[PDB]
């Protein structure tokens, strides 16, 4: 289109003289090799291209060819169960064709142009279609991919390819104007996919963990954040959500996380089971990988590619759960590019539009009723990693006030090896009062009254634990000692969970309800007995203590009978004395 | 006493951090002023 | 018109044009590009060589060859009317609705023209809220601006909706026309997400207070200079409907932090000598310019009162945004995270939240002849209780004098019965009865603030 | 050869060479002046009207009339061979030894080339160190990164020398041919002094371990660019030997703090927005650039394992250097300061230390079936010992009980018999035997973690 030459090279930013008409935010090809970049400024007749690759070895005079299209992705069938780069390049094919090291300049198509799928028409000639309608389906592993009409396209169909087997480069529907509808379409990543209207979430997002499904829940359209210092369990928590959530598909983004985690999920998932259908777990994962040593700006490219893939899968009628990683690393990439642009900074280096960028990214998430009429949802769980473990970095004060829940990890609980180390004294979840109808309908009928009892037990036990630290656990009355011991039972029997077990890594709602019931019954009857006159030495040492201490290691296939037996055992062993 | 010493150290670190940003902006302003006055011979 | 082609620089917000001196300073433009899509702008720093624009929407697709800029109006001005009292606008002022634009009755500027210090009058009338921590200790009168220093996960939208629903004047306590006065909300939001907007709209639609309120929406997936523009439009409409048609308006400005952010961003991209910790020097001037538009004049009978919600970022009263806002307005209400932990509602910390225009709107002949005295005494007793809390935490609860325990228990009863009030509509008399019930828990003669006459009459 | 005279500006470390459009970005040059001396350079930020060059050593004695820079090669590289397996190099890679220079087999680039995340496998085997605490509760595996958080007056280089002089991969425990896995050590040091240099030389040459090692040494009176270059040279040689000749290298980098200092100083001379307490913004990017080069690839049978020793500047675990390092690497082993006062060696507090890739390198058929159980039990027992110790040291030993005396005796005997080990070399069998001999001080049945099979076989 517009052909120019290089004028100056300085790090990851290239200036190209002789570019009159080069639109802003366009994809151009830098150098004699092809080093896709993105125009982010215009000064007279030049452009301030920012490359996405190593850009170390380029001369001054190599051509620069623009293309006029602003960083599109390639939506279509054949996307699940695969890796990608930040620019949506299959790492599998890259490795298979060009050795084990990541090379630059290699160019592979996003989808696969040789595999053929089973088309099935759902449109007759002379019909009337408009953007968002479906045209027919093709099958994937245990799903049914639909074939939408790209947004903002209309007309009157005139012919349909009959049912059979075709590739992804076959125009299967021809409108009346002359255009051709293939089995895929491209969409820019810096826009939002239009919808009809945005509903309000009234359904929990069950992740499996007890703290995050009881104390601080998240509606299945919401947002969240997991800040916390280094070495506290953020990676393990996010992978546990990825492998035991209740979403249809999962899109794991990682921008700045060590490659050992990506290899862990890659070599672990294909031998697990999706707990909704029964197929392999990796048949509902589209993980995106851009590790620490790879180029920088590919970080933000990866964030946007992830959100756009999640929006597409929402538009098909599923309910996806994006799980970003190190929005802090993303902000670092933004700061680097800004300081290369040489503009004035804000508090602590970051450019003064971090907040707007984060707000748009988080506001592309919510339950919606798409253009086909069917519903969908996009959850978001964005990790953060402050520079010193203090929740005052701009990227962890700009990511508050725009989210729902907030899951503050803690270094004390993390070093005591009290894992998942979610500080229950400094977290909050604003989706906790719109889920009471669903709880009363689908878990119990006195559930929201049994949860506040536990929360209050904890928030009154802390105050007494202060004086406990003061004068030791001796002068505390029977009341305060019983409070202390029931608080310890609660902490190390209900809140704690070991994610590396076989059966104790996924606690159903009924199981959590049962454990809460048993602890509450123990508390009530122990208080009654202490009022009657027995002492604490007699109270504690019953065998029912350790009989409920092993209550979480039991399995869901038999928990009801165990719980019945244990409640009757409390009934008995607290009757004699 | 150690808790107070830790608090003091943190406050002191933040206060010193918020001077280098000022020195940086001042140096940039001086560079821009030199670049401008290098073109103000007459007009 | 399609004139003024030949731009020569584009980077972020700004955009430069070559020789163009007939564009007046502070004008309005519209930037058509090579495919027909029209954006908006505003001229800053005109000069004989070039002229700097400030684009509103965004700068994607703008090339340097096929791109023009045309003049629309030499000054910003909004076309106001009275027909816009059930409508719903967005940012600059287009109608985000299924109805066509309005036919204006007069078009006035949106920038200023302050009120003359001799065409004002002292706000005196008294508007109760049903929140006994604002009716009795931080009185709210008609004609005063009073923010709400919120927090991250603290309920401020709920308190704003409750005030807007319960607020009513009390004419039968000082002598006035019995039933004449409903309100007229001018809710103006800049930066709200989807959840909060849906809550606000549900609540306004439940009480039927929607057919008498105008709405300006600037949700979080929109540009930022539109956030810079919105509150001026809101206050223009409010001043019109007040000082021309004798209404009584109540402007709810939400999240002034996002407005300050857009301000800091344009200032940074302008390289304009950061004042204090980021934010530029003239932010006091800007916040004052959009706060001082709420008073009462003499001769007329309208009134304009504000409640600017704002979230102090890191819970610091020493952050520039809360600091300058407190210096400019007259009064404040401050929530408390510690009280929010313990289920209190509304968690309004009563110590650090005062209102200045209160000694003139309360007292004998307006509410009751013993109001400010109960206020002073309650403040003193609560401060004593809070201090004895630390005395306990040092010593122990059993080594306390016989009256220190009385003060401690008064503080706890105060936090448990006077502040916590659920969602119920109290009255000035019910709240004063509760206050006297509490103040009777302390002995007589240890209240050096109230007079012996009131002391004998109420106990 | 002679080309590129005509420089135009010299100030500090920079040098502005005029028209030169054949120098590529990041190339390597050599600045020769009117006395014959030759130094280095690096073309950063090339342009059209000139090309900025950054000198390595110093710009003393340089003129604008008698000076000429010339190209050396396109990118940076060093010539690697196999024979350097008893050698000793220095920084840029010049042999400072008693043997002639080396020949190349090929010269590889010394930067970048990240591993394809689909082209590696999981670290599964394990490597014995002879240190009981490490081997039993933080067992280092083949293909992980594990820093050692030292202090300012603690023995760290001694522990590093001991680990390099004792380590070996046990080929008989889990199962494979015994003499099929070679080994090496690519010890690289930076910023050391003459005392520590002599210590390392003598300690390596005593036991003849140097027959399976290389050495890169960067005495602290050399220009800082060499201190920046050393780790890249070491890691290039390591990757070569491992993924091409099937060795099992073990890289050791002392004083990453001196590397971070050199980086801050070399960067801050180009005015690039100092990030956090000095150190620039991209320090995470650089540390991750050099750490992630250690892994285990599938198809091949080599490995690379790193142990970067670093010293927390002022015992801060919230300093930028320890923070970034902890965010990049996986697991960390932290030396203690209190144990060093009581005269224990190697002083390692197992409370704040852990390894993530641990429970994959032990267990069923790996070392012995009781490894994870014994680790959990020793951790729990030492934790309870410290708990009761704090309790007593606070109040007094008047009212202890039976179960508490068992745990206090356990804590004491553990700290004095399982941590303190001098210069011994305990195999993992002997380490587990000492673990069981310390566990047998506790009543069977109150060890609520270990299973009953091993309980019956041992103890």
Curated annotation (Swiss-Prot), chain A:
GO cellular component assignments: proton-transporting ATP synthase complex
Domain of life: Bacteria
Binding locations of ATP: 228-235
UniProt EC number: 7.1.2.2
UniProt entry keywords in alphabetical sequence: ATP synthesis, ATP-binding, Hydrogen ion transport, Ion transport, Nucleotide-binding, Translocase, Transport
Catalyzed reaction equations: ATP + H2O + 4 H(+)(in) = ADP + phosphate + 5 H(+)(out)
Entry's family note: Belongs to the ATPase alpha/beta chains family.
A family per Pfam: ATP-synt_VA_C
General function of this protein: Produces ATP from ADP in the presence of a proton gradient across the membrane. The V-type alpha chain is a catalytic subunit.
PANTHER family: H(+)-TRANSPORTING TWO-SECTOR ATPASE, V-TYPE PROTON ATPASE CATALYTIC SUBUNIT A
A GO BP entry: proton motive force-driven plasma membrane ATP synthesis
Protein name per its UniProtKB record: V-type ATP synthase alpha chain
NCBIfam families reported for this sequence: PRK04192.1
GO molecular function: ATP binding; proton-transporting ATP synthase activity, rotational mechanism; proton-transporting ATPase activity, rotational mechanism
From Swiss-Prot, chain B:
Domain of life: Bacteria
Entry's transmembrane regions: none
Function: Produces ATP from ADP in the presence of a proton gradient across the membrane.
Family statement: Belongs to the V-ATPase D subunit family.
Name recorded for this polypeptide: V-type ATP synthase subunit D
Organism: Thermus thermophilus (strain ATCC 27634 / DSM 579 / HB8)
Part of the full-length chain shown: 169 to 211 of 223
From Swiss-Prot, chains C, D:
InterPro entries to which the protein is assigned, alphabetical: ATP-synt_VA_C, ATPase_a/bsu_AS, ATPase_F1/V1/A1_a/bsu_N, ATPase_F1/V1/A1_a/bsu_nucl-bd, P-loop_NTPase, V-ATPase_su_B/beta
Keyword Cytoplasm: no
Gene3D superfamilies assigned to the protein according to its UniProt record, in alphabetical order: 3.40.50.12240
Domain of life: Bacteria
A single BP term in Gene Ontology: proton motive force-driven plasma membrane ATP synthesis
Keywords for this protein: ATP synthesis, Hydrogen ion transport, Ion transport, Transport
UniProt record similarity statement: Belongs to the ATPase alpha/beta chains family.
PANTHER family: V-TYPE PROTON ATPASE SUBUNIT B
Protein name: V-type ATP synthase beta chain
């Amino acid at each position: 289109m517009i052909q120019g030459v290089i004028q100056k090279i300085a790090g990851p930013a290239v200036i190209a003289k002789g570019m009159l008409g080069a639109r802003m935010y366009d994809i151009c090809k830098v150098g004699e090799e092809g080093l896709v970049g993105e125009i982010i400024r215009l000064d007279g007749d030049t452009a301030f291209v920012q490359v996405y690759e190593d850009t170390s070895g380029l001369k001054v005079g190599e051509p620069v060819v623009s293309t006029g299209l602003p960083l599109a992705v390639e939506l279509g069938p054949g996307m699940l169960n695969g890796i990608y780069d930040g620019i949506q390049r299959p790492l599998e094919r890259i490795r298979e064709k060009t050795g084990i090291y990541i090379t630059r300049g290699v160019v592979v198509h996003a989808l696969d142009r040789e595999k053929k799928w089973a088309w099935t028409p759902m449109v007759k000639p002379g019909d009337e279609v408009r953007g968002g309608m479906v045209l027919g389906t093709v099958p994937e592993f245990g799903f049914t991919h639909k074939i939408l009409v790209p947004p903002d396209v209309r007309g009157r169909v005139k012919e349909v390819k009959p049912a059979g087997e075709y590739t992804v480069e076959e125009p299967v529907v021809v409108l009346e104007d002359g255009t051709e509808l293939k089995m895929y379409h491209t969409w820019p990543v810096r826009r939002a996919r239009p919808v009809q209207r945005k509903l309000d979430p009234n359904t929990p997002f069950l992740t499996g963990m007890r703290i995050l499904d009881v104390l601080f829940p998240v509606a299945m359209g919401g947002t969240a954040a997991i800040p916390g210092p280094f070495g506290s369990g953020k990676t393990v928590t996010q992978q546990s959500l990825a492998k035991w959530s209740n979403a249809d598909v999962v899109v794991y983004v990682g921008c700045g996380e060590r490659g050992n985690e990506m290899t862990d999920v890659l070599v672990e998932f294909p031998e697990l089971t999706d707990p909704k259908t029964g197929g392999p777990l990796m048949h509902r994962t589209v993980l995106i990988a851009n590790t620490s040593n790879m180029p920088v700006a590919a970080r933000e490219a990866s964030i946007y590619v992830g959100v756009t893939i999640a929006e597409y899968f929402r538009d098909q009628g599923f309910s996806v759960a994006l799980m970003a990683d190190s929005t802090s690393r993303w902000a670092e990439a933004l700061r680097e590019i800004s300081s290369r642009l040489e503009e004035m900074p804000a508090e602590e280096g970051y450019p003064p539009y971090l907040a707007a960028r984060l707000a748009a990214f988080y506001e592309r998430a919510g339950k919606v009723i798409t253009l086909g009429g069917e519903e969908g949802a996009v959850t978001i769980v964005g990790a953060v990693s402050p520079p010193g473990g203090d929740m005052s970095e701009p990227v962890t004060q700009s990511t508050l006030r725009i989210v729902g829940a907030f899951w503050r990890l803690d270094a004390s609980l993390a070093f005591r090896r009290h894992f998942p180390a979610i500080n229950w004294n400094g977290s909050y979840s604003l989706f906790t009062s719109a889920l009471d109808p669903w709880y009363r309908e689908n878990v119990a009928e006195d559930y929201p009254e049994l949860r506040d009892a536990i929360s209050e037990l904890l928030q009154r036990e802390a105050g007494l634990q202060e004086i406990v630290q003061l004068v030791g656990p001796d002068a505390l009355q029977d009341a305060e000692r019983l409070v202390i011991e029931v608080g310890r039972i609660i902490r190390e029997d209900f809140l704690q969970q070991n994610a590396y077990h076989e059966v104790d890594a996924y606690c159903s709602m009924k199981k959590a309800y049962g454990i809460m019931k048993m602890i509450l019954a123990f508390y009530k009857e122990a208080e009654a007995a202490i009022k009657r006159g027995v002492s604490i030495d007699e109270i504690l040492q019953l065998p029912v203590l350790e009989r409920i201490g092993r209550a979480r290691y039991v399995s869901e296939e038999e928990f009801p009978a165990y719980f019945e037996e244990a409640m009757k055992e409390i009934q008995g062993a607290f009757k004699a004395l | 006493i150690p808790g107070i010493r830790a608090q003091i150290r943190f406050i002191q670190q933040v206060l010193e951090q918020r001077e280098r940003e000022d020195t940086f902006r001042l140096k940039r302003i001086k560079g821009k002023i030199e670049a401008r006055e290098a073109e103000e011979e007459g007009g | 018109k399609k004139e003024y082609t030949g731009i020569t620089y584009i980077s972020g917000p700004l955009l430069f044009v070559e020789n163009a001196k007939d564009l007046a300073y502070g004008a309005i433009v519209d930037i058509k590009d090579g495919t027909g899509r029209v954006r908006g702008g505003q001229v800053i720093e005109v000069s004989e060589e070039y002229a700097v624009i400030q684009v509103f929407e965004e700068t994607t697709g703008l090339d340097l060859a096929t791109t023009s800029v045309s003049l629309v109006e030499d000054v910003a001005r909004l076309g106001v009317s009275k027909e816009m009292l059930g409508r719903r606008f967005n940012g600059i002022g287009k109608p985000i609705d299924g109805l066509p634009p309005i036919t204006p009755e007069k078009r006035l500027p949106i920038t200023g023209l302050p009120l003359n210090p001799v065409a004002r009058r002292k706000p005196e009338q008294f508007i109760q809220t049903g929140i006994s921590t604002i009716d009795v200790m931080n009185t709210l009168v008609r004609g005063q601006k009073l923010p709400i220093f919120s927090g991250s996960g603290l309920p401020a939208n709920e308190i704003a909706a409750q005030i807007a629903r319960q607020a009513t004047v009390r004419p039968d306590l000082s002598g006035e026309g019995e039933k004449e006065e409903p309100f007229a909300v001018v809710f103006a939001a800049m930066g709200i997400t989807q959840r909060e907007l849906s809550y606000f709209i549900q609540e306004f639609e439940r009480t039927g207070a929607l057919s008498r309120s105008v709405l300006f929406l600037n949700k979080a997936d929109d540009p930022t200079i539109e956030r810079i523009l919105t509150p001026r439009m809101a206050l223009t409409v409010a001043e019109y409907l007040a000082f021309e048609h004798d209404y009584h308006v109540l402007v709810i400005l939400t999240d002034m932090t996002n407005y300050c952010e857009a301000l800091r961003e344009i200032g940074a991209a302008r390289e304009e000598i950061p004042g204090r910790r980021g934010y530029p020097g003239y932010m006091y001037t800007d916040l004052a310019t959009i706060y001082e538009r709420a008073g009462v004049v003499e001769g007329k009978k309208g009134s304009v009162t504000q409640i600017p919600i704002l979230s102090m970022p890191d819970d610091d009263r020493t952050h520039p945004i809360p600091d300058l806002t407190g210096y400019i307005t007259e009064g404040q209400i401050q929530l408390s995270r510690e009280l929010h932990r313990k289920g209190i509602y509304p968690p309004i910390d009563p110590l650090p939240s005062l209102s200045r225009l209160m000694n003139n709107g309360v007292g004998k002949g307006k509410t009751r002849e013993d109001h400010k005295q109960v206020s002073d005494q309650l403040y003193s007793a609560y401060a004593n209780g809070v201090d004895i809390r630390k005395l306990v935490a040092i010593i122990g609860e059993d080594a306390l004098t016989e009256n220190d325990r009385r003060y401690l228990q008064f503080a706890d009863a105060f936090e448990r019965f006077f502040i916590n009030q659920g969602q119920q509509n109290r009255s000035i008399e019910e709240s004063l009865q509760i206050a006297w019930a509490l103040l009777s828990m302390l002995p007589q003669g240890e209240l050096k603030r109230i007079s012996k006459d009131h002391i004998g009459k109420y106990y």
